[PDB]
Design a protein around this ligand. Sequence first.
Ligand SMILES: Nc1ncnc2c1ncn2[C@@H]1O[C@H](COP(=O)(O)OP(=O)(O)OP(=O)(O)O)[C@@H](O)[C@H]1O
Ligand SMILES: Nc1ncnc2c1ncn2[C@@H]1O[C@H](COP(=O)(O)OP(=O)(O)O)[C@@H](O)[C@H]1O
Ligand SMILES: Nc1ncnc2c1ncn2[C@@H]1O[C@H](COP(=O)(O)OP(=O)(O)O)[C@@H](O)[C@H]1O
Lengths: 370, 75, 370, 370
Amino acid sequence: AALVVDNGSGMCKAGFAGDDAPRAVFPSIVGRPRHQGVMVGMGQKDSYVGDEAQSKRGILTLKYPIEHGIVTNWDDMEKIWHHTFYNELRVAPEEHPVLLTEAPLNPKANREKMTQIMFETFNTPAMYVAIQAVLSLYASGRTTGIVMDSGDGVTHTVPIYEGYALPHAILRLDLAGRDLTDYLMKILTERGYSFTTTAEREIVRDIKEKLCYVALDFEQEMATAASSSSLEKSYELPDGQVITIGNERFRCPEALFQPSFLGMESCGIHETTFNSIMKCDVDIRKDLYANTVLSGGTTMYPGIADRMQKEITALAPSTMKIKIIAPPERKYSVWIGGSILASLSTFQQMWISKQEYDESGPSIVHRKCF
Amino acid sequence: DPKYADLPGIARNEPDVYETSDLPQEELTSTSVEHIIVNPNAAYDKFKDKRVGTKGLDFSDRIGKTKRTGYESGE
Amino acid sequence: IANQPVVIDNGSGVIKAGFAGDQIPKYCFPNYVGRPKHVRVMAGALEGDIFIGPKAEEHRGLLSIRYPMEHGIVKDWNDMERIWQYVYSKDQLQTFSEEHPVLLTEAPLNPRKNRERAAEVFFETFNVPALFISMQAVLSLYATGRTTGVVLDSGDGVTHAVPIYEGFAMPHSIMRIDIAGRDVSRFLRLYLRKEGYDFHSSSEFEIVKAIKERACYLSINPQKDETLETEKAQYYLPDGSTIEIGPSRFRAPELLFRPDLIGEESEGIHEVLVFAIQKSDMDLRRTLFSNIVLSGGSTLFKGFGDRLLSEVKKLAPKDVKIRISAPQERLYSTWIGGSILASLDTFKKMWVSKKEYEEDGARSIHRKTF
Amino acid sequence: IANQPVVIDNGSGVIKAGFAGDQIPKYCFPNYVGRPKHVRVMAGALEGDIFIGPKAEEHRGLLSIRYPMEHGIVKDWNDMERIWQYVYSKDQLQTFSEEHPVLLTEAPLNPRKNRERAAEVFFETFNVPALFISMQAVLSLYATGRTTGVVLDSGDGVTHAVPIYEGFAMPHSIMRIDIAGRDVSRFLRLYLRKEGYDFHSSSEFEIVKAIKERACYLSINPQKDETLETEKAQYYLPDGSTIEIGPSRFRAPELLFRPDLIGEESEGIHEVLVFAIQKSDMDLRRTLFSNIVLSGGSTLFKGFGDRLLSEVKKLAPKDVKIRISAPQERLYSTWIGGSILASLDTFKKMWVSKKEYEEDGARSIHRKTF
Ligand SMILES: Nc1ncnc2c1ncn2[C@@H]1O[C@H](COP(=O)(O)OP(=O)(O)OP(=O)(O)O)[C@@H](O)[C@H]1O
Ligand SMILES: Nc1ncnc2c1ncn2[C@@H]1O[C@H](COP(=O)(O)OP(=O)(O)O)[C@@H](O)[C@H]1O
Ligand SMILES: Nc1ncnc2c1ncn2[C@@H]1O[C@H](COP(=O)(O)OP(=O)(O)O)[C@@H](O)[C@H]1O
């Protein structure tokens, strides 16, 4: 009926209104080869969208217009979107209204640029963009809750109390798994696993999803893992290389708990969320203690809820019970939350049509934000 | 320089520090402010001679005789 | 002691210093506590790791600058002690506590613990013979010569109105709000993130303050000047790089009258002063109306006072003449008033001896003070 | 030991050494592993392969020379050992490891394994009682006298551009490229092969490297001089063979800044340096523009610094005064600073004793390393 288009910071997801499985599950990454003196290989594309770039990853320069979600060259992602239509659903955007994703503390010019692409370029009959965390809590089925949203490009805890705007405590945080992967390939380089390009990064981010977990006592677990030679597990890679990871698996996510590893001049994720907590009414924060909504697909980690929980629990009073809300499908609950969100009665009226945009210009984005 | 002489592979004619030839309040101006000096020594000598007497100017959560006043004594 | 009394202009964000016999503070500097964010192995960098003055005023992108006076209330007193030792150091005074009469500043209705902790420092670690610390309002009264009035002393991160007629206190009318210009600078980086400028550092916050003190004012009409088209003044970075401004420069201190933007309830301190006016006597009010005390460097905005005059016209009755008392160097005005107070000989009963602290301390502080 | 410390001018392509008090590394020679071009199974061949200096400078069409340290990655450990023994011999050192303190210098992106393995040889085969491992940028700064600076090096393949203010160990400021003149000359001889000049043997290519260090430059108008019809000045080999060069004399080195047709789309360290600029802060950036240091041997080119000056001029915005310090002995600058470090008393405590190595080893390396 509509177009529920998710814009994942890493991969992508999409589909119509009310669709259950995300159709455009492909890398939301841009890539181009080394356009040099050689000729074309039997005729082929210039830009390589997702899986195409993922396929011939040895030469295609894996880039992103995305800067922790901030798209620089909108041409990239819009051509990706065109092909995404004519790739997954093969439907024009003019017959079905679109639904998009966003993150707080985003410059409005980004969304307005996006908007004018949908109208001037895509000619969508109606359109809408909302925060991913809303879809996460939507999938949970709540309205009161601190939706700790965590994309693989950004992070933003979203405290809500009966679907109400609390942006003073809501804080965007450009925390990407890519950043961890940066540090990870760096520490691998001193471990003899010296690799440079982004193809290496794709392989090791998949390895990050393979064995990089979250321990419980980083230094103690670090010393024991240093002693636990069996924990330094190996895996013969697609290439003849094998790996060795025992510390690295949990050594790398401590940068989230400790900005010191990167010198982010910030706080660790657990107390960062607690800092966002500290910007509210402590008695409704009690509900937020119960509303420990751990969301964002970049939270699919082994031993992460107890870690984070225990940390903030040490920060919280005894009566302030942490009650984790974290379904393993929270990664899909973003797009699926938008997919079922499209089926909302009020939302079928809450729209930004052609003339609504044109006759208002990009100014309509402000009140039509949320 | 003597090191340059004794080292054969070291070439010369190098402007070593290669560089870029680079070439090189209102609030008081309002329609209603009157920023004035008190003439510190003048006003100081004025109020300076004005002795002030005090006698236990005590107030913090002190209960007894509801009304109180600082600088109780006279001078 | 029969020495020159140390006149310290301890403002929450701007802590200057000097002596009484001097009409100009020679040791002026803001609030800042920097800790090196970088490791240093090779010789060439000086240490101490808590830098005040030049090191902090040069190596801003190296030191984790702290502003320990949280709303003028400090809890990391140790750092302040070291700053006072820095004052006792060669760069500022080369003297001792015992060697000189000392004079610091205060805010109204502070937590007693802070006063007690300060007295612990200055009479246990430091051992000042005779010392007393009081409100900045009296200092301003000396800076004006006035005795009647509502001292509107609203510094860096504290806003307070002090209604005192002829040198007679009225605490029920006296109000105090621990938020000011520091938060408007906080709101300025909020504007930065509104248009995507992640300048999160305290040094970056100082750059923000440089714009605050460089390109910011007060447009007397709120929406009439906000909804217009802005020229977006290109500010020049600490690299001189162009960065536009928008309506931001004048709409930023609006929050001081509508704290709802930050999610806070208040009235705009001037209205709190009007409440104090209401708490005062009918015709004795008019005098205080004419006693427009202007204090705290945060008042530096073009059209600032005139916007407040417009506020008066919106809220005060007719012909109740108000008279702007502007100070020339508002920050020194406080210090010079302190220089006048410290140079008072009669200060015997007004000071507090060290042995007095040895007798009761806290009880004698709060006892002798208001 | 309390003797004259061995000051080593290390390197992947050029490794020299001398002592403290010496103003020059007494025996200047590059990094190379000289093996014969023939089967040394039959007696009377170039066996031993310990051909450093005149032995390598003796047989030309009989030696297939190798290179151990490849971009800070040394694999010919035993070949390094025999090169060490050549140095330890009375032609270069005239003393022993036990008899003199030794100083090791490095660069970033060096895995711990190389350091550990080299320290194993240096403390077990050779036995330095006073051995220390360090950097090279620090030594270049020592030679220049500066401590604040964007130090760069142009080794054989060693190129790190880390902005280091006052000797601050800033690992997040690390921007290291592992490529230089090595592969440049390799594809420059590929150009020679494009015009019929095959250089497949090492020595056959070492002559080409002598041309690289002799008849190769940077035409500051690369595409303009490329579009301009070349004249192709004739080179004369040790054989005296007439070889024209022309555009290729500057093509491959200008290709460092413009890696367009490489496949390895590198940067040209100015881009990497701009990335390091981003890592730094405008207040420090403004200073560090004037604080730029160059090192290594690949810096030696006609129009080198001026071309890179033009590059950054096209990169940096207005009112950006940049100064790039670069003496004539960029190679020796490391050795000069090594002698300077040898003259340091802290360095005596900085070194790891042989017994200290026996106690910990790798942990002592990476803990007492700085
Ligand atoms: N098994 C796993 N182990 C470790 N990490 C995982 C695992 N599964 C998923 N992840 C994390 O999930 C992240 C991708 O999920 P995420 O939904 O955040 O992608 P995204 O593109 O940011 O989507 P969006 O931008 O819509 O939030 C990866 O960075 C990875 O760290
Ligand atoms: N032009 C300006 N615009 C806004 N705020 C300013 C300006 N100049 C100074 N300030 C603020 O006022 C402060 C100085 O006022 P002061 O009374 O010293 O504050 P405090 O007493 O709290 O240190 C500075 O710290 C600064 O934050
Ligand atoms: N005139 C020159 N032109 C080009 N490259 C040079 C020149 N002189 C030296 N080099 C390169 O620089 C290297 C020497 O620099 P150095 O820092 O010692 O390298 P490394 O540290 O890799 O040994 C040589 O191996 C050579 O590749």
